[PDB]
């Protein structure tokens, strides 16, 4: 069917929502596997979480027009390829794209994808901050940066860019809303 673009700040539980969806409907949805130049992280699997590629290969991909969209984040490259999206869609599954607000804006200007847009918001920026500080892995400076980005995305969502906004203040309720949205059909 029409692909679904899901976006939202990291720390909102969005990865969990997708995990539940792929378990319950593994034959209905396919995940767009992004290409990235960043270093893999524990548990990540090449070809599943991401297509981890070199900088040379990423530059090559750009030059050969292999992307639907691409961006940099923290000095590394990320992008959605034409290939991954067609192998899934071709496959007969509904393609889900997990990309940031730059990606959303890019796909919006591709009328032919006819994508649907869903944004997963945090219950508040103050709660997002707590979660981020609660993990112990980032600096003061990186959290300020992520909070500014989250604020930007919340502001963009108020222009009505997304088909639906879901506030994830409970995993199972957001999961509900997610299903109601997706299976609305179009």
Ligand X SMILES: Nc1nc2c(ncn2[C@@H]2O[C@H](COP(=O)(O)O)[C@@H](O)[C@H]2O)c(=O)[nH]1
> Which residue, 97 or 174, has its beta carbon nearer to ligand X?
97
Cβ–Cβ < 8 Å for 45, 52: no
The binder of ligand X chosen from 12, 103, 117, 178 (CB under 6 A) = 103
Does the footprint of ligand X cover residue 105 (CB under 6 A)? no
Q: Which is nearer to ligand X, 81 or 176 (CB)?
A: 81
Strand order in the sheet with 94-98: 29-31, 94-98, 4-7, 116-121, 164-167
Q: Which of 55, 73, 133, 176 lies at the binding interface for ligand X (CB under 6 A)?
A: 73
CA gap 80, 22 in Å, rounded: 19
C-beta of 48 vs 186, nearer to ligand X: 48
**Using CB under 6 A, which of 20, 38, 93, 164 touches ligand X?**
38
Greatest C-alpha distance within the chain: 45
Secondary structure element (H or E) that encloses residue 36, with its range? strand 35-36
86 in a known ligand binding site:
no
Rounded to 5°, the CA angle 16-28-52 comes to: 60
| Closer CB to ligand X, 27 or 37, in the complex | 37
Contacts to ligand X by CB under 6 A: 10, 34, 38, 69, 71, 73, 78-80, 98-100, 102-103
């Amino acid at each position: 069917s029409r692909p679904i673009v899901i976006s939202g700040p990291s720390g909102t539980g969005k990865s969990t929502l997708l995990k539940k969806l792929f378990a319950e409907y593994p034959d209905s949805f396919g995940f767009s596997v992004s290409s990235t130049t960043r270093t893999p992280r524990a548990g990540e699997v090449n070809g599943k979480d991401y297509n981890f590629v070199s900088v040379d290969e990423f530059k090559s991909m750009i030059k050969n027009n292999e992307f639907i969209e691409w961006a940099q984040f923290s000095g590394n490259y990320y992008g959605s390829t034409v290939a991954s999206v067609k192998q899934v869609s071709k496959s007969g599954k509904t393609c889900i794209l997990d990309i940031d607000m730059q990606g959303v804006k890019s796909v919006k200007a591709i009328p032919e994808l006819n994508a649907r847009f869903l944004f997963i918001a945090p219950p508040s920026v103050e709660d997002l901050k707590k979660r981020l500080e609660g993990r112990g892995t980032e600096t003061e400076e990186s959290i300020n940066k992520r909070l500014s980005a989250a604020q930007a995305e919340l502001a963009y969502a108020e222009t009505g860019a997304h088909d639906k906004v879901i506030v994830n203040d409970d995993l199972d309720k957001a999961y509900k809303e997610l299903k109601d949205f997706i299976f609305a059909e179009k």
